[PDB]
Subunit: 219 residues, 4 copies
């Protein structure tokens, strides 16, 4: 039976039947958004949903026999597995983000269809080339996030009261979002020199971010 | 008469007479902006407008004889037809955006003058090579737009109440416009971890957009 | 005396003396900022300034005889002429921006030092190759600015009431500054579809500017 | 003993021990953030901290005997000295920013581990190629900062009242942060033409920065 089903699984139909299902469950998940719609056809799609999930667990079971060890060394397959595993955790108990993480299965459209995979892989491949940069930056963030907490957290604890808060704020200043009128001018009303912290912070971080872009243009 | 008019239409004079009309109607539409101006010369320019609109239909009628099917397979020609047709729809009934879209005819200065034609085409040509990225992105948006609506739409409906609102709001976060002080800091006031949803969204979406720019710096 | 002064003017010393003056009057203009300082040395500086202006006119007088027609065909020389001319208009009569445009003379530091001339010229040279783009864009702005004035100026005249206002507002949307929370969300409170006008505006204008940057990173 | 210690200092184990301490002290510093933690194990940390600082002076003492003049001509070594020196200044008292500046020692993780060194150096090298451009920009800023102070500082002293303030504000406009709704629309409420000052400022400054980015991609 091994070769029987290995012929079912690798068939253009089977794979095209799944891709057909992704687009249906995605269309169906957009419909689950409407508080009105759910009032009419809520049960249609609750069942239809549990239905697709079985189909999806069946496939992943089928796909493993056919691939064995090869399946758990393929990123895309591991993925498909975890995105379905998530989709199996009961509609109850624990945390309920897991209910919302069920929508992550529409990322199977990225998996099941190549080209997307071409492009996604294309994107991801640039990440190893960025890790030296990313690492640098994280040290830098880490250091300043610390200074800022102990420089501004007493008067300004929403923004800097905690190490994590400073991180967040720093992220915001880095994305250059409301940084002056929102954060640094306020800070200066108490600490006239805070500009001395934040203007330099902006330079290094914009410079770094620029360099990283010119580097992704090194290919 | 075919060859008569094919030599009328294809003449430098014809084209340059139209181009003379574009820059005149365009000047005249800037003039229709002023509530003052309209109180003196509103009559001049409403009639002048109907005049230019005839001239433009006459031209388009003529241009079709000279080209036949060749005309309805030219992008630039179709346009002028569509934009003139828009400018034909009466000044009453239906919606009023059709009145306002009349100003779209000034895009004939792009259509009826080369180099512009070159440049626009140069731009558009880059699009097909973005279509894999653009597509990737639209899935991602679609996914998160769904997640957000069911995570925040109860307490924060203006921003996330409806799928369409989540899209808009997400766009705004992507353009990085008031994302922290406007949306995410507020959101965290009720859902402390919302930072866990939006910072990641920011990285990917910003990354993706970076790749797309380096890609355009490939062709 | 012609060859006498052509040897005075073309001297390293002549130029280095002027350059010495630029840095001093610039230093002195940074000093004229203090309401305090003017109260202790206002006259020292008012006279020093009137002094340097002569020194610069004497130079321009000399420089012209030494160059004749060659002078009014050198950009840089014309500049220094017009910049110094501005600096000649009296303190009392006319517009008072003219008093402020005097500080434009510090741009002579750009004019009198060749290494700067290199870079400034480097910058400017890219502009001709953007004129095809810059034009495209100006047409676009012109058309939309017209559309917006007639779509929003009745309920929202501050942002859109006048042809020029829309330009300003559109610019702000384009620099992507508070476009959503500042303008488009408000606008949607009356005209639900304004999102239909402004998102597409953002795409084109963002796209175009990407192309223009990729184009410069081509030349 | 010279060769004794030269074989101690240059040892892989020596290098590994210090890098061990950096990751420990940086971890140590993150914990120093919690007002909770400090009440519990504050003592543990302040002594371990003084301990590490001893170790670090000893290392630099040893390292100099082993390099003599060679040390104070190495950028990275100077840094380590100047950073540890900062950490040497007692817990009192004049400026307490000196206490905060202690955390700068975590940049030794940048210093003691190569590849980081590789990358940082890569970043720094681009600076010389921007200095004509950075200079250009600084003169430009300097000139406008003066004009703005004298054009708006009477009515808008918070933003423009002082040379330094104009600098801050201009920087804010340049980073393109809240520039319209925060500054220029206001300004215009009193001085209708301020748009004539800031739009042009924005073009140049945006252009130059773009040029500087393309200039970087050149190297
Ligand atoms: Ca902003
Ligand atoms: Ca803002």
């Amino acid at each position: 039976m091994y070769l029987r089903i290995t012929n079912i699984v690798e068939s253009s139909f089977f794979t095209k039947f799944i891709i057909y299902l992704i687009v249906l469950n995605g269309i169906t998940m957009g419909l689950e958004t409407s508080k009105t719609f759910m009032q009419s056809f809520g049960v249609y799609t609750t069942l239809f949903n549990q239905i697709v999930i079985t189909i999806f667990t069946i496939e992943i079971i089928l796909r493993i026999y056919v691939h064995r060890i090869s399946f758990f060394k393929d990123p895309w397959s591991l993925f498909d597995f975890f995105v379905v595993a998530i989709s199996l955790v009961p509609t109850s108990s624990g945390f309920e983000i897991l209910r919302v993480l069920r929508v992550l299965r529409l990322f199977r459209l990225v998996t099941a269809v190549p080209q997307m995979r071409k492009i996604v892989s294309a994107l991801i491949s640039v990440i190893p080339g960025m890790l030296s940069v990313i690492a640098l930056m994280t040290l830098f963030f880490y250091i300043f996030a610390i200074m800022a907490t102990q420089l501004f957290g007493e008067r300004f604890p929403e923004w800097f009261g905690t190490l994590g808060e400073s991180f967040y704020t720093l992220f915001q200043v880095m994305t250059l979002d409301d940084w002056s009128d929102g954060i640094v001018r306020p800070l200066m009303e108490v600490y006239p020199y805070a500009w001395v912290f934040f203007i330099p912070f902006i330079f290094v971080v914009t410079f770094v971010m620029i360099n990283l872009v010119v580097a992704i243009c090194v290919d």
